[PDB]
Write a protein that binds this ligand. Structure first.
Ligand code: SF4
Ligand code: SF4
Ligand code: FCO
Ligand SMILES: [Cl-]
Ligand SMILES: [Fe+2]
Ligand code: NI
Ligand SMILES: [S]
Lengths: 283, 483
């Protein structure tokens, strides 16, 4: 990239998120987050990092959204709670009116080029939608569909996603758009999504079938304590067999570790996370 | 003289999570304040019915900035409930995992959240647009140093997360802390890798971060004269230094009305009159806590409960810990206090109560604490034994209870778990930004930040920058506060 290159506008809205999807992005190695922000995208609204605040920040987003109607990318971090008329997630106030996440997604969703549902909460509901919850936490694609909003959605799940899945999906989309324009490019992106909306370059391969401990699994050699790194982790709860992600190769945090080496996979990229992957520490 | 202007700020940005602040300004000063935590998930009900061991994964998703704190409080609560005896080497490994995130979080807070309060960034989003009169006082050179350090700090904080992940598996949301200890024995090779990263972080902290906070502070000396609030603080203890449970890097204590007092956790109660929870649940200690949302309840204004300590409204965080524990100041702090402020100081309390409990004092405390944590991590790197086991594998109890106490980067954190029929029967969280960013209690006494806003200057109601500057000095995390 270059400081003077074309950089599309991005709004990043937090619903029922934990800010971990933002933090994981800050950990991008190549390109670094400084390069992403200064050379790849124009992050026009993001409550955790932006300079302005309050109604002025909301109005700035609205002005950019009007100027770039149909052309901005909308990132959602967290689920969208529909109970109690949206009151379980208020994202701002302007013109003496509170703005719920429900309101915000109905406002900006129809006018985005694409919605990037970043993290398992946004993609599939995640922990806020799990058993024992009562807020009506809803996945982005379902919320948009229920409200007749047709904007394309790309899911980039994980709890959190790896930074490379987020940045890499942005790069893949921007490349497709450079080659084919916005509509043709998004069509090419949609063609490489699996049935759960996930890009196949990152989510097209199963952890277990590519796991370094697969020989031990097949031999029935299972670790009985977490600190035994020779055996397979299946009896300790590893959900690798049911999980589609490239962690076995990409690893985490600059390649220093990953979940299976360190402990177990908890299936964090899967639509049934957490309840369908729990208990975490039993098969 | 001027009359009243009421100012609402939603979202407060450059914090974590969903916050509205509303202040009443009269004659150029804040005279009243209300803080509203705006997003609820309900972890305390989601957790019920689960295998208790799942909690040390689920609870981290309260917050992806401080997940190691929740991991730590959860595994400590589970250790107690299960009767798990963490091996000595696992205690040290846990300290290395969690300590590295203190470095990450304080660096993130000062540079990536707070520094734009004082520094003009590059002329592109997300650094513009901003208030036309932002009160940015630094010279061209010092401002550029701030921007250059912001950019370098993006790499430094990422390296801190590599340190966390070396023994924690990944970050955000570690895999490596469980009931019974830590899941991965440190090897000689990985300890070399941790130490090499730590040296780079140490050099940035010592040469750039601590000096820049004092230097910027010396251009904003007025910010040591506001933000005192109640001048009351809480520390519950953190980072065990042996296996007795009695010795910790930060020792517990309460400070209020000019007096040090012991910490007795039975004196914590959570009030809800001004919070969106059922009125029948007001005034409960966490061991009997209940979480029944009431989003339509008249008069309430926040999803944060109102914790009080024997009726006192207290603050938490680096200032609280450094004030309660009163460690020696860093060498560069002692030097710059003398050179830039004319202050002769040896220990943290030598700043004096008024300057410590101030907007800029909280930034200074956080930088000083980052330096203090370097020495603790260095000690743990000398104490750890490569190859020695770090975990035990305890059976799940049918009936049990436990409480885990620690200090998250933003302040005191406890998790309480009750197990019945081998499943979670209750799980209650009392977190750092709960102590700081809560609403009024049932008697109408303000929360700590609400009270610290009183007296904040607003000489220009069109550019009321000091309101959020004060809030950011406390490093709020509303996702932690509400859970
Ligand atoms: S169960 Fe887990 S550790 Fe075992 S081979 Fe499969 S992915 Fe690897
Ligand atoms: S190894 Fe499993 S739990 Fe870890 S990040 Fe990959 S998919 Fe998520
Ligand atoms: N640090 C942190 Fe998170 C908060 N507030 C906790 O506890
Ligand atoms: Cl933490
Ligand atoms: Fe709580
Ligand atoms: Ni937090
Ligand atoms: S946090």
């Amino acid at each position: 990239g270059t400081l003077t290159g074309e950089r599309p506008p991005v709004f990043w809205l937090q619903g029922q998120g934990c800010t971990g999807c933002s933090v994981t992005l800050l950990n991008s190695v190549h390109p670094s987050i400084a390069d992403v922000l200064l050379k790849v995208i124009s992050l026009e609204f993001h409550p955790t990092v932006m300079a302005w605040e309050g109604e002025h920040a909301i109005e700035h987003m609205r002005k950019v959204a009007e100027k770039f109607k149909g052309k901005f990318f909308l990132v959602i971090e967290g689920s969208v709670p529909v109970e109690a008329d949206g009151k379980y997630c208020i994202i701002g106030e302007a013109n003496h009116h509170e703005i719920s996440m429900v309101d915000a997604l109905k406002e900006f969703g129809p006018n985005a080029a694409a919605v990037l549902a970043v993290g398992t909460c946004a993609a599939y509901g995640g922990i806020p939608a799990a058993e024992g919850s009562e807020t009506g936490a809803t996945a982005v694609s379902k919320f948009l569909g229920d409200n007749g909003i047709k904007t394309p959605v790309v899911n980039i799940p994980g709890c959190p996603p790896h930074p490379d899945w987020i940045v890499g999906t942005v790069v893949l989309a921007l490349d497709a758009i450079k080659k084919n324009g916005l509509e043709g490019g998004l069509a090419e992106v949609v063609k490489v999504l699996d049935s759960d909306g996930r890009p196949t370059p990152f989510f097209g391969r199963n952890i277990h079938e590519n796991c370094p401990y697969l020989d031990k699994y097949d031999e029935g050699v299972m670790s009985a304590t977490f600190t035994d790194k020779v055996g397979c982790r299946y009896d300790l709860g590893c959900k690798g067999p049911m999980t589609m992600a490239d962690c076995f190769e990409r690893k985490w945090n600059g390649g220093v570790n990953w979940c299976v080496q360190n402990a177990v996979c908890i299936g964090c990229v899967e639509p049934d996370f957490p309840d369908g992957k729990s208990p975490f520490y039993q098969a | 003289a001027t009359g009243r202007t009421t100012i609402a700020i939603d979202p407060v940005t450059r914090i974590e999570g969903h916050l509205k602040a509303e202040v009443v300004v009269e004659n150029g000063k804040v005279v009243d304040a209300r803080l509203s935590g705006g997003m609820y998930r309900g972890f305390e009900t989601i957790l019920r019915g689960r295998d208790p061991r799942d909690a040390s994964q689920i609870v981290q998703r309260i917050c992806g900035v401080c997940p190691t704190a929740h991991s730590t409080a959860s595994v400590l609560a589970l250790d107690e409930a299960f009767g798990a005896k963490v091996p000595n080497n696992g205690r040290i490994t846990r300290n290395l995992i969690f300590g590295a995130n203190y470095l990450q979080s304080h660096i993130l807070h000062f540079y990536h959240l707070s520094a734009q309060d004082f520094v003009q960034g590059p002329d592109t989003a997300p650094f513009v647009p901003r208030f036309p009169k932002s009160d940015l006082r630094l010279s061209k050179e010092l401002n550029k140093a701030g921007v250059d350090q912001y950019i370098e700090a993006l790499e430094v904080r990422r390296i801190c997360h590599e340190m966390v992940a070396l023994f924690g598996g990944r970050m955000p949301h570690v895999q490596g802390q469980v009931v019974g200890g830590a899941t991965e024995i440190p090897t000689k090779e990985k300890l070399v890798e941790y130490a090499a990263r730590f040296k780079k972080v140490r050099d940035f902290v010592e040469q750039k971060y601590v000096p820049v906070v004092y230097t910027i502070g010396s251009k904003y000396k007025d910010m040591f004269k506001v933000g005192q609030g109640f001048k009351a603080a809480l520390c519950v203890g953190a980072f065990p230094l042996d296996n007795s449970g009695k010795k910790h890097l930060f020792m517990p204590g309460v400070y209020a009305k000019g007096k040090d007092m012991p910490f007795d956790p039975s004196k914590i109660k959570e009030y809800v009159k001004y919070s969106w929870f059922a009125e029948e649940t007001t005034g409960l200690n966490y061991k009997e806590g209940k979480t029944i949302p009431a989003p339509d309840k008249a008069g309430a204004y926040s999803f944060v409960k109102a914790p009080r300590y024997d009726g006192l409204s207290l603050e938490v965080g680096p200032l609280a810990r450094m004030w309660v524990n009163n460690p020696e100041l860093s060498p560069v702090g002692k030097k710059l206090l003398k050179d830039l402020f004319g202050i002769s100081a040896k220990k943290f309390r030598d700043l004096g109560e008024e300057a410590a409990f101030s907007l800029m004092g909280r930034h200074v405390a956080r930088a000083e604490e980052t330096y203090y944590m370097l020495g603790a991590i260095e000690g743990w790197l000398k104490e750890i034994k490569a190859g020695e086991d770090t975990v035990v594998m305890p059976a799940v109890p049918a009936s049990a209870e436990g409480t885990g106490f620690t200090e998250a980067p933003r302040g005191s954190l406890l998790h309480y778990v009750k197990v019945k029929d081998s499943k979670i029967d209750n799980y209650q969280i009392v977190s750092a930004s709960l102590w700081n960013c809560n609403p009024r209690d049932d008697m109408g006494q303000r929360g700590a930040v609400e009270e610290a806003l009183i007296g904040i200057p607003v000489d220009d109601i069109q550019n009321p920058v000091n309101v959020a500057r004060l809030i950011r000095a406390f490093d709020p995390x509303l996702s932690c506060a509400v859970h």
